[PDB]
Nucleic acid binder design. Structure first.
Lengths: 51, 239, 176, 149, 161
RNA sequence: AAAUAUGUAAGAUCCUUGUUACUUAAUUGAACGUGGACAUUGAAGAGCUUUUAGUGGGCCAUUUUUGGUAAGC
RNA sequence: GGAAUACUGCCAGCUGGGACUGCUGCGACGUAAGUCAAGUGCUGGCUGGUUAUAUGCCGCCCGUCUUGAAACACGGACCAAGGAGUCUAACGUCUAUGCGAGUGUUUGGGUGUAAAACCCAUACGCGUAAUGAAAGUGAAAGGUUGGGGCCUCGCAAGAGGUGCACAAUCGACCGAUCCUGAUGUCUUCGGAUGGAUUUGAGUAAGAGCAUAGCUGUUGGGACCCGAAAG
């Protein structure tokens, strides 16, 4: 019946991670893609005044 | 001895199955980067229709009283609630509603959504609390340091590994950027998203810029009460 | 094990990792304050001259200098000053090694060694001044203002320094 | 605070009626009678108790009836029958319906019911000399209730 | 602060591995159960363990009559009876429909009657080996709690008012 | 009255089929009960039992008071 | 329309740098060789207490009495030793543990080493149903629901069957009452049926007894002492 289940372990120990860049590779994907991606960024704002 | 050793190789497969997920996340993250652009711009976009419509609006308004006719903006905004004030000299009353929001101690935090009913319940809580909308970014900074792990496991933080691979999530994507976007938009079962793990346990403010007087309201000139701008400043200090 | 409570049993050698991040001081800190590293020289005082390798900061100023003397010898400092300005040799220390031990040729090699950097130094001293140079040496602190010039340059000079530091030691026991 | 007299509660289980009150039975009269002379006992055992025992203990001589159903005096089966005045019979164990339990046992009864002959699978319900009351043993000898030294 | 949090801490746990074990066998047998429960699926084996750990108030006497009607009488067609406490002898129906009965303890008469009827009387160790998954099993039963040594206590017990 | 108030302050499954009942004209109805089928902002703050102890003399403040000129009444 | 910025974001991270650390599922440079995060070296040597100062607890102590104790409330000069929940009964539990719808054995006899011990006949109770002044009489079925569970399943969900602890809900019975009372015998009166009731009992509300160490309760002096007393 048993060999159907396992062992062992554990293991947290630290967690306090951030900004790095190395831990900032882990906390992200997106924020790395986005990281190129930002501001908001363009144009136009002038009409809105001018009016 | 040979045969269990072959079982150890299989663990290299498990090493692949999540990574196949990693690749899925990279894509998800790329789509959700455009979803980030929208969260930032939306507030800005509302303002454009007023601006476009009205030359009239500004000059009359600084100089004199009266208001002009034609348009008007409605607004939603979700909230974040932090308990400044302690238990001492209060009824259990109001305390049992704190326990309901899940502000267990001072420098506890809970997010709340946009509605009149919460506010009315929040009114009994009120002299417990500074509250307001923190912006898209300060909330990102808020999750990273203060967030914690779910039940069926203890406290394990919101830190990098633990969100990407773990965190339950029936409704939608748990991953760090996806989860944060999704609560702020306050769409479907983002109230189930805001069934966080459970309270953010905030640091005391540095410099006491987070503490203007406990005595006072934002109208008295203190900390108390609703304030969007000040809550983002306040949370930065809670770091 | 077994039964039956439970003592030990030993271990180690592990870790782990860093690497880009290995590096970042390792030239550097020099970058903030200017200068080369050690070996550093008496320009001043006297005109022609001299060498020492900076074994210590007890703190900055209070600095340890050395060379050889197992028997009768030659001297040695802890000093808060008296005379020293930098050269163009750099190690991967700043300035930590030490005691006042050396010995085999040390005084003499360091003496031949100096000639070159000092000979490089005196024209640049004539080019700027000399009498003035004492007042700089007297300081000791130091460092920012002007770290220059050339000299020409190292390979042998490093060899003495590396040795001096290694030399600075001793083990082998003794009663005197 | 104690002595033990303070506290103790109260000294003796009284003041329980007076001021205090709860529990037990309190406040008596009420019946008394029979005295210490014309008194106890009448022994009563359920027919299930012999019924269980019907298989072990038991092949008990004839007549007509079967392999397991056996005639048994209930008087020889009940412990402490000899100091008892009379021995009385009850009624069966459990098994579906309003419920039977099969034996065609029966003898030696010093009292039996109208719900103890009837739901017992048809029987030779036989009563003892002692049971009848209308028993005559004017002089002479026998029936005589069982005694043992 | 406090509360719910204080209340949970204020409680307790939960079972508890039984106070004293006079029987050596009972001390290892219970430990064997937590052992089996944890390596595999079996919920019953984990449940039985707690009950063996509690004293007079958890451990159930079950009678032959109570087995005979309940699981036995052609219902399910002959499962495994897990009697946590002990069986007691009390039944005659010219019993029983089989069966493989499991318990900590049996009376002599109970073992005797059950083997003659069918199955095996099985003190639970033999059952655990052959059945281990714990399917085709009923955990039967209580009482325990019913009416003769409940809060029917203390004098001339203890009705309604 | 209307209170205005404010704390409060209790309060948040359906259908069909058959069979039974029922109170009330040999009279009209529901509603009962069953048997069978169909279809539906919160989070451990939490249920029950046995046994146990220290009272069974309080105090201050805040708010709302009632007596008292008042009072560390 | 060019005209700082209030209030605000990100990444780009440049850059000065203190104080506390030391087998898992990955994300990132690299087709390639493979590697980057999570979960430190080089020299000179080889602390607890006790006497006395700075600063703070302190408004002793410890107790207790108290709403409030330093108390101008109460007790003790100092120290060693002595100095307070005892025994068992009986009732109720808790807890184990052995036989179990009965279990239980004084004392004899036999044997016995130091008393002890053991075998057995087995002196004698609360259980095995109850009511009640007493005559007298005397029964076991059935669900409804949640949920522990199996199987039929599909399987990281789940329902429908089938069996039921348990508790809540319902009825139904056995005695007691209270009331019609057959069959009838026919001096006499013994008693089926059936219902309502309150209470007590029985089935799915079925089980102890024994000793043990312990708690409570009454007790006996009853945790100890303290009084004038009769």
């Amino acid at each position: 019946v048993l060999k159907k289940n396992p062992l062992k372990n554990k293991q947290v120990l630290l967690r306090l991670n951030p900004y790095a860049k190395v831990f900032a590779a882990e906390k992200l994907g997106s924020k790395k893609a986005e990281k190129t991606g930002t501001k908001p960024a363009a144009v136009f704002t002038e009409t809105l005044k001018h009016d | 001895i040979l045969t269990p050793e072959s079982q150890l190789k299989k663990s290299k497969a498990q090493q692949k199955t999540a990574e196949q997920v990693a690749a899925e996340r990279a894509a998800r993250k790329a789509a959700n980067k455009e979803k980030r652009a929208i969260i930032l711009e939306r507030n800005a976009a509302y303002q454009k229709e007023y601006e476009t419509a009205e030359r009239n609006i500004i000059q009359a308004k600084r100089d004199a009283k009266a208001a002009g006719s034609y348009y008007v903006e409605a607004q939603h905004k979700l909230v974040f609630v932090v308990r400044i004030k302690g238990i001492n000299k209060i009824p259990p009353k109001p305390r049992k509603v704190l326990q309901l929001l899940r502000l267990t101690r001072i420098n506890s935090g809970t997010f709340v959504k946009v509605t009149k009913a919460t506010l009315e319940l929040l009114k009994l809580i009120e002299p417990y609390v500074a509250y307001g909308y923190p912006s898209y970014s300060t909330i990102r900074q808020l999750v990273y340091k203060r967030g914690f792990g779910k039940i069926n496991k203890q406290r394990v933080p919101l830190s990098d590994n633990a969100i990407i691979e773990a965190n339950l999530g029936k409704y939608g994507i748990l991953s760090i950027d996806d989860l944060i976007h999704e609560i702020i938009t306050v769409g479907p079962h983002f109230k189930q998203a805001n069934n966080f793990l459970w309270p953010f346990k905030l640091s005391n403010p540095s410099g006491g810029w987070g503490v203007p007087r406990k005595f006072k309201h934002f109208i008295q000139g203190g900390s108390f009460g609703n304030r969007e701008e000040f809550i983002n400043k306040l949370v930065k200090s809670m770091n | 094990m077994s039964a039956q409570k439970a003592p030990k049993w030993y271990p180690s050698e592990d870790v782990a990792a860093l690497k880009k991040t290995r590096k970042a001081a390792r030239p550097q800190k020099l970058r903030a304050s200017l200068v080369p590293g050690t070996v550093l020289i008496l320009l001043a005082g006297r005109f022609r001259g001299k060498r020492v390798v900076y074994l210590k900061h007890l703190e900055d100023n209070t600095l340890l200098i050395s060379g050889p003397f197992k028997v009768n010898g030659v001297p040695l400092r802890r000093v808060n000053a008296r005379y020293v300005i930098a050269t163009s040799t750099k190690v991967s220390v700043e300035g930590v090694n030490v005691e006042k031990f050396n010995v085999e040729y040390f005084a003499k090699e360091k003496l031949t060694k100096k000639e070159k950097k000092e000979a490089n130094l005196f024209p640049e001293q004539q080019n700027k001044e000399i009498k003035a140079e004492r007042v700089e040496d007297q300081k000791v602190v130091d460092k920012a203002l002007i770290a220059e010039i050339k000299k020409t340059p190292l390979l042998k000079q490093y060899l003495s320094a590396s040795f001096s530091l290694k030399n600075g030691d001793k083990p082998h026991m003794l009663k005197f | 605070m104690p002595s033990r007299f303070t506290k103790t509660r109260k000294h003796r289980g009284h003041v329980s009626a007076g001021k205090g009150r709860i529990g037990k039975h309190r406040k008596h009269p009420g019946g008394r009678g029979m005295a210490g002379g014309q008194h106890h006992h009448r022994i009563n055992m359920d027919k299930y108790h012999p019924g269980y025992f019907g298989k072990v203990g038991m092949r008990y001589f004839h007549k007509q009836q079967a392999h397991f159903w056996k005639p048994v005096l209930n008087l020889d089966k009940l412990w402490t029958l000899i100091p008892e005045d009379k021995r009385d019979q009850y009624l069966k164990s459990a098994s579906k319906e309003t419920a039977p339990v099969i034996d065609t046992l029966a003898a030696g009864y010093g009292k039996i019911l109208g719900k103890g002959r009837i739901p017992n699978v048809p029987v030779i319900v036989k009563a003892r000399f002692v049971s009848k009351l209308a028993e005559e043993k004017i002089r002479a000898a026998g029936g005589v209730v069982e005694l043992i030294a | 602060m406090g509360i719910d949090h204080t209340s949970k801490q204020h409680k307790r746990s939960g079972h508890r591995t039984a106070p004293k074990s006079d029987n050596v066998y009972l001390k290892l047998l219970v430990k064997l159960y937590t052992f089996l429960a944890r390596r595999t699926d079996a919920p019953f084996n984990k449940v039985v363990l707690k009950a063996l750990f509690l004293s007079k108030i958890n451990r159930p006497p079950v009678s032959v009559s109570r087995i005979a009607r309940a699981l036995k009488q052609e219902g399910a067609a002959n499962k495994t009876v897990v009697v946590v406490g002990t069986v007691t002898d009390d039944a005659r129906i010219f019993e029983f429909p089989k069966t493989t009965v499991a318990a900590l303890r049996f009376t002599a008469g109970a073992r005797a009657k059950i083997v003659k009827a069918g199955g095996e009387c099985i003190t639970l160790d033999q059952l655990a080996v052959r059945a281990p998954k714990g399917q085709n099993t009923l955990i039967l039963r209580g009482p325990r709690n019913s009416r003769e040594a409940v809060r029917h206590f203390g004098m001339g017990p203890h009705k309604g008012k």
